[PDB]
Amino acid sequence: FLKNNWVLLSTVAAVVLGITTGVLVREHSNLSTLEKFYFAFPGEILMRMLKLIILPLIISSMITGVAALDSNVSGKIGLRAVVYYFATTLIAVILGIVLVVSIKPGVTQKVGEIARTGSTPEVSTVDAMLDLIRNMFPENLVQAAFQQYKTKREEEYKIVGMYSDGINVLGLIVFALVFGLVIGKMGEKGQILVDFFNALSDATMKIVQIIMWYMPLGILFLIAGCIIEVEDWEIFRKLGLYMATVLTGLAIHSIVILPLIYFIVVRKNPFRFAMGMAQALLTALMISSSSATLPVTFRCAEENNQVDKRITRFVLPVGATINMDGTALYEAVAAVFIAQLNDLDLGIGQIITISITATSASIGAAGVPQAGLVTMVIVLSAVGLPAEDVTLIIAVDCLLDRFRTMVNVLGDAFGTGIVEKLSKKELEQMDVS
16 A cells, blocks of 8 residues: 555645644644744745646646547537536535525524624625626736736726736636637647647646645645634634534535436446545645645546546636635525624525525636635625625634635536536547547
């Protein structure tokens, strides 16, 4: 078993050791504010090392996957993937609404005891929905590689725009898809570009494999530092039911709904599918970033369970940005909890409004600095509640974001096989032409 499953064993041992180190240092020592940063420094180095790979990997993988197919086949596969993602997001939103309504956590608790932290960002709903489309088509490609576009109202108000930092994944993916479609059709004129991007993708995969060797040491200090940062257990005890209901929703989704759909579509063991991606699930748990974890998910999905290259190369980059299942669940649950905190009546129209708003805003908050706060503000504004109440959950927002990424990765892994089976006729038909 050793020397072949070394990476997974090292990751598990690092997780256990980091938990032990963090709890011991917190319980039997006291550190200053500055020293915790120097204790978590290796985690930051690992996080920037993983952040750097994202751009070339995403671009080359998307271009290769799109150019490896034909126009009609690419259209059909993209349509199937989009339909599957939308259906699973809508089902997740319904599940979250039903669970949070049935549990009724906010009624028993009192608003006065809970303390507020952080601030409420200024959000305009229509402006955000238009910013999505504006970012879909950036003005500059080089600027789109590390910057995003934002618009705010100012003055009977006029619109003024500005550029802020942050890689624009959506616009890059759209342009890569168009470029891959074009050079797939060019043929003998675009073969050199296809070869260039294939080589770039392979080199990026090798660099990722190199980074995976150092990953466990970073993970140890990442976990230890994250555990150290907690101030007291009173905030967790007061908000225990909120974590209970979000985690119950995520677990129910992951264990029931996705394997059930997999069984209605295909016929195999969904749990054999799920157990082969433990490395990717852990990667998601500690790194907690769907884009950063993409190389690991790619590698595990390609190697462990033998999936075809075209389906993986085309489904994984799209599912990185579009698939938002845990996010929507958390938005719905937290928003309804906030509504319960205040005096409100749960009408059917209001529930339908929340159901639509959670999905729409979660799709809107696909890639942004703080998706959760913006989505919560949009949902509250649609309902009519004040936007200041987003501050309460911030103290316990970080914990769930670790499991949301794991759920998203599992959903992408299941959807890859689902689409593969669905379009298995085309793969065989076009193999010789």
